[PDB]
Point group: D2
Chain length 298, copies 4
């Protein structure tokens, strides 16, 4: 099984001019690797892919992949509405030395199931790289059901996992049973912090979640405990992870929260986010601080 464990959706750090902050992004990558994460996912939802252009995405992926310099596995999110661009971005990631790609379903038109299967088979066929599906139905308006994912796993041997982003035990349980019952080594990662423990107890593989950025040690330690057979210890970390997502309510989009949390937990970076996101105000920044306090994360 590929891309198991704790794989944070890394924030892209920008300067006040809205340009890739290389020193800041590099420093975050290095903090993460040292914290013992199992890989790194650039240009996910939290990486701000949907607010960046194609050439910015390429320059960021290239910088990120080069800086990681093969210390851990690197995933690049290459999805969008423009299918020709998805292929372009996917082929670029392979060429640039990425280890896999993460592909969201098209999220403007909710395309027919025939067109959807066709779309994923086309992007899978454009690269020799492993492909991770990305389900985030709150944003897309179109669920990748366990049956559809099994159909895709059946069709293409490089479709090898899913980031399932949903506040639903049922969806995760059903994803694991249906897809991993057919394909034991297909990887299921939850996209929310507070589902990581259940995902592992269900037979899934880890998490790609926001708190990987500012509190990686919690998910890293939970995974270690679980793999060590120390379930009480794992549950202690899960208790923290249960409370973290309160902070995400502070703004929508909450990419600003995540970066402000990185700063508060001890890594000074610029916290600039791209429009239509906006800076987090001082009150809500203070609120974020007391929440991290109250969880001993800072």
């Amino acid at each position: 099984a590929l891309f198991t464990g704790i794989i944070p959706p890394v924030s892209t750090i920008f300067t006040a001019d809205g340009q890739l902050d290389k020193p800041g992004t590099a420093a975050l990558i290095d903090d993460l690797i040292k914290a013992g994460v199992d890989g790194l996912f650039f240009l996910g939802s939290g990486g701000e892919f949907s607010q960046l252009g194609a050439e910015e995405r390429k320059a960021i992926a290239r910088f990120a992949i080069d800086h990681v310099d093969r210390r851990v596995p690197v995933l690049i999110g290459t999805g969008g509405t423009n299918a020709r661009e998805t292929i372009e971005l996917s082929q670029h990631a392979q060429q640039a030395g990425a280890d896999g790609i993460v592909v969201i379903n098209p999220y403007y038109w909710k395309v027919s199931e025939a067109n959807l299967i066709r779309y994923f088979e086309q992007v899978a066929d454009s690269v020799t790289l492993p492909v991770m599906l990305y389900n985030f139905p709150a944003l897309t308006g179109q669920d990748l059901t366990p049956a559809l994912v099994k159909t895709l796993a059946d069709s293409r041997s490089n479709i090898i996992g899913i980031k399932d982003t949903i506040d639903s035990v049922a969806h995760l349980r059903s994803m694991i049973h249906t897809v991993k019952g057919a394909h034991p080594h297909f990887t299921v990662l939850c996209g929310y912090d507070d589902h990581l423990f259940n995902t592992l107890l269900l037979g899934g593989d880890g998490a790609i979640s926001a708190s990987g950025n500012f509190a990686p040690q919690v998910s890293v330690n939970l995974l270690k405990a679980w793999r060590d057979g120390d379930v009480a210890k794992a549950a202690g970390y899960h208790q923290t992870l249960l409370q973290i997502p309160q902070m995400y309510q502070l703004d929508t989009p909450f990419v600003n929260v995540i970066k402000e949390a990185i700063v508060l937990c001890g890594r000074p970076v610029s916290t600039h986010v791209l429009p239509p996101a906006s800076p987090l105000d001082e009150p809500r920044k203070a609120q974020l601080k007391t929440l991290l306090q109250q969880l001993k994360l800072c």
Copy 2:
């Protein structure tokens, strides 16, 4: 009141290599002007804006505005998820000689109301051109309520109309009462064929709907009858417009249907559509044909 009447969401015609087909899209523009439409909207949902890159969108806008050569008012859809690019596209449209822009709300993240208002005020401020809002909640997953639209119309004097794309008499009626009650010259256009008659009877302004492409005369004739005070004749056309939308069920996305309907109703163009959309099969094409024949549209 700007941009009233019948304003088709013009299909972008592509060659089989997926490049702008210039003769084909010129031919379509010319068909539409001659059919007596009150304006033309390029790069809406049916224009395939979400499947095109920024530089493609610019070159298409340029070609289209140029070809129209001011014979009617021209609208360009400049929206997306990347707000910096929306501003870039909006400024390009103004520079290229468009008469207005149409701006959909961001449709990946469903941004907070504060961020949404801020987004629309920033793009409105980026141009000196009139701005039409674009509501399509079935695709965006975020409705632009009548109260929100009224707030925006209050905030910016260049936010001057809305394309309201919803199968809902209540939404339209409430959009007209709430916004036009405050701003009598604010333009409300429905985005569905089968609501044009109701939109007019409610005190709204016209339609930007797909059948504008292949059966413009029905809408143009309805509007002429309505403005002439001949309501039985308008309702005659409405009866045809009530039935047209059956064809949109044939595929999803149904941009392929619209282009095949252009061909069947007498204008030979490539049908090529961009991925993730795909060619309409011979069976559903035959179904389209009997439907159009049915309605005496070919």
Copy 3:
């Protein structure tokens, strides 16, 4: 085709004790018959069926049927969540002299399609009377799709119509094509005032809508103009019907608004509504009056 034209969902008039007001309900019934309605529907949604017990419902139906004394067709709404109670109420309706029953799908559990079909088949089999289905998904949380309705009409020859209560041209168009395509005399009635004109133009049969209570003449005169082929005259009435539904926003539930409109339009009755509905306040009554005045309904 059974139960076509204008069939008001008659309000049940209650004294302040919460008991059936016989003189008041009688007076309403007689006004409606004199107005030229094609039938009367008791204990629909606007009839407060879900706020009444089985024995109260039996008493109301009996009173209502006897008072109509066969001068128009009578429908009784017999649905709920307790299916044994549905059969009891449906058989009582036939025994009491009703001409048909109107049955909503169960609206607590959204029961499986197999259980749903079985439910409608058992109730249809419990009586020898015409059975009209009732779709109201905003309240039930379970749409009766055109396909399912067609399956039910195929299955049982006394399943002969539907009240389709939805603000959707598509749902009404599709119900007409799918079900009436297979069953030419299957009756489709819209449940909203502002869809009556479109329903008739689509090939459907009439309406069961709240405004039949306080402004029956608008719908009655629309239907008459349409059957006379005076479409312009019909569309004039439709313009009033387009506007009426702004009053239903004044409260939820809005049975109070409907009874207050009855009084305002010239028929003094108790306004009492059953819990959890409550009295309309004075300011909202004043708003309602100016609306009715406005539309020259009083």
Copy 4:
């Protein structure tokens, strides 16, 4: 803090005549008490309250309370759509010897926030008994938000808890923070098996879930291990509770499954369920058995 811990939504056992099976129901009640549950909740969703009439409900409550004979706390589910009936049933429960009532929001009309508050306030004023709210938005179409629940707790001091029936970590977390932050001894009980562990870790109080009927020891043993500070032993039971809910997919509604699981697990009763539920077929009963085998529940 009232009604904490494990409180099964007791199945109502019916003979094939659709009548209360007193020996069967009494045997179930005794198994549950002997298993060490913290209380018993009759006429919840799984108790078929919505398929029963007022007088049937009174007879069941009375029988249940008398048979329990004060050995554990007894809750009666008194809600419905008919508010007058709710008051009747709520007052009867106090009179019959119940320790508390559990009241769902009205589920036909989604009544205004003002009507809803008034509703809960008037049922809580009709009794001197503790009142538990019941949130089940998948069925009701109307969520009881943490803010509304806190408003109700602020308003009436006998409104002392909630059954929150939702597959959502966020809704449970936010209910606990909002309501228990203002009212430390307000009880939050999850309605799903697979949320019991999370509910306790969040600072909530227990569960009312279907598996309390056929596998009460799993929840009882989870709660005991947690209160003993044996978190690893609690997590082991949670792993079973994670997997149990695949059985509820076997039918909708799934009250049949629950009764068949009671039989399979060692207690022979009528499985009769009330229409529009139906018998579980032989294939699905076999599936259920292999699920219970596989979790060592029988």
